[PDB]
Point group: C2
Chain length 278, copies 2
């Protein structure tokens, strides 16, 4: 059995190649839109959401060809959300991962439309997947529920509404559950659906994915202090937030404790969510 480290490298290379083939060429008109779409999603990175799709499918022995559309779709939703988030009317960021944000590299109109078109391509890839129609529909329902006003978009809105206000712990947790937790749970659910998981196992994996999405954000908050006025270290104290993260780490491992080596990839994504330095 291949180690988690080897699997993550293989899946990161795989999703890079799949996304490159799935996006329109920069030489086809409209060239600026296509260039901006590619600029916004190609070029590496953690690929946490594709990795969750593959790692979840891996629990069931599912081949990557059955997972590629689901894995691309969650990265495309994630990528589009960041293109819009970076806009001057939103978070107003000029740099992302050491490179100019998409609206700086191009312009705001191009960034708006590139985000719009990446969202459509996420759904199109699922609808076009070489899978049974019932499975494509189940994946599409999952992604839509997690990405819209009941998930990612709603969480973005809760965040914008809270600009300049101090959120309570309850409200901060709820905001993160929508803004990033929902799409992280969708990634795990879709991988397991492609693995033909049944509902009890879907619910168990959802409990793991729920904890992982929060863990990632608590860790991020801790790192920000070590390197949206309300954060887990500000509301809990730094020691309290570290204890919160430590419990989520233990919780994630306990949920998967009965699996064999087939869960090592998911286990390692949990460790990365808790322990990464960047």
């Amino acid at each position: 059995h291949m180690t988690a480290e080897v699997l993550f490298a293989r899946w990161r290379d795989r999703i890079e190649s799949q996304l490159d083939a799935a996006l329109p060429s920069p030489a086809e008109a409209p060239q600026r839109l296509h260039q901006a779409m590619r600029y916004s999603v190609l070029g590496g990175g953690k690929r946490m959401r594709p990795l969750l799709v593959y790692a979840s499918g891996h629990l069931f022995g599912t081949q990557p060809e059955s997972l590629d559309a689901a894995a691309m779709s969650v990265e495309l939703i994630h990528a589009y959300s960041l293109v819009h988030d970076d806009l001057p009317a939103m978070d107003d960021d000029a740099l992302r991962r050491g490179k100019p944000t998409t609206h700086v590299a191009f312009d705001e109109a191009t960034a708006i439309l590139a985000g719009d078109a990446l969202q459509t391509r996420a759904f199109g890839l699922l609808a076009d997947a070489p899978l049974p129609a019932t499975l494509r529909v189940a994946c599409l329902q999952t992604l839509a529920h997690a990405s819209g006003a009941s998930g990612m978009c709603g969480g973005q809105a809760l965040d914008i509404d809270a600009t300049g206000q101090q959120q309570t712990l309850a409200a901060l947790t709820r905001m993160h559950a929508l803004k990033t937790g929902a799409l992280i749970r969708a990634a795990v659910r879709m991988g397991a659906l492609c693995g033909q998981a049944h509902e009890p196992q879907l619910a168990q994996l959802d409990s793991f994915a729920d904890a992982l999405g929060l863990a990632f954000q608590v860790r991020d908050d801790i790192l920000d202090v070590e390197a949206d006025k309300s954060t887990f270290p500000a509301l809990l104290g730094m020691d309290g937030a570290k204890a919160q993260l430590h419990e989520l780490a233990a919780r994630m491992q306990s949920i998967l404790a009965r699996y064999g080596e087939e869960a090592d990839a998911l286990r390692a994504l949990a460790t990365l969510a808790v322990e990464r330095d960047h």
Copy 2:
């Protein structure tokens, strides 16, 4: 087309009620996003694209209940595209239909997100529809292809890229075929799929829908004056092109019985409307 007008009023009332039931409550969190989503699609309008879905299904005797998801989805895509198109970085409009645009009634960030969420809701409604999964997938494929970079979004980008430039007649026609032609064809296609249409009928209806989308744009350009088709062809040349499209649309549907009257009336509307 008076009997058709009654049908269209029924369908405009129906799609208003359907969209109202499908959108989140303005009392529930996040309230401002939900309110902006509702502002951006409720409150009447022509409902051309839902009417095309219902009328295309009507050709096959399909009842509206089997068409609501598809009809809502094309209006939601259309609605989101206008919210983003009105933004200052795009067309920069303060009014639409005599009322403030969404980013004026709310703010730019809320409008961006409302557009994003309406797009998602369009896909979720089709995916959740009470229809065979194979039919839901075919409609979802149709909508995604027509709405993204190879359709509506691509046409919007072409339009912005040509700002201040003189376009050839071919380029302008290509731009409109993506910018609004694709989603109009999608509406007719989805109605026909829900009607269990056979491949020749789908191709026939797609020829009709292609002509209808162009005619609708040519008529909106003519009304706007009262690079565009009037600018390239003259006001008289634009009107001649409209009449040729009208005759093509009626020719394509000519062999059908009264079940095509709804589509025929939408063709007449696209050409003759004062609004």
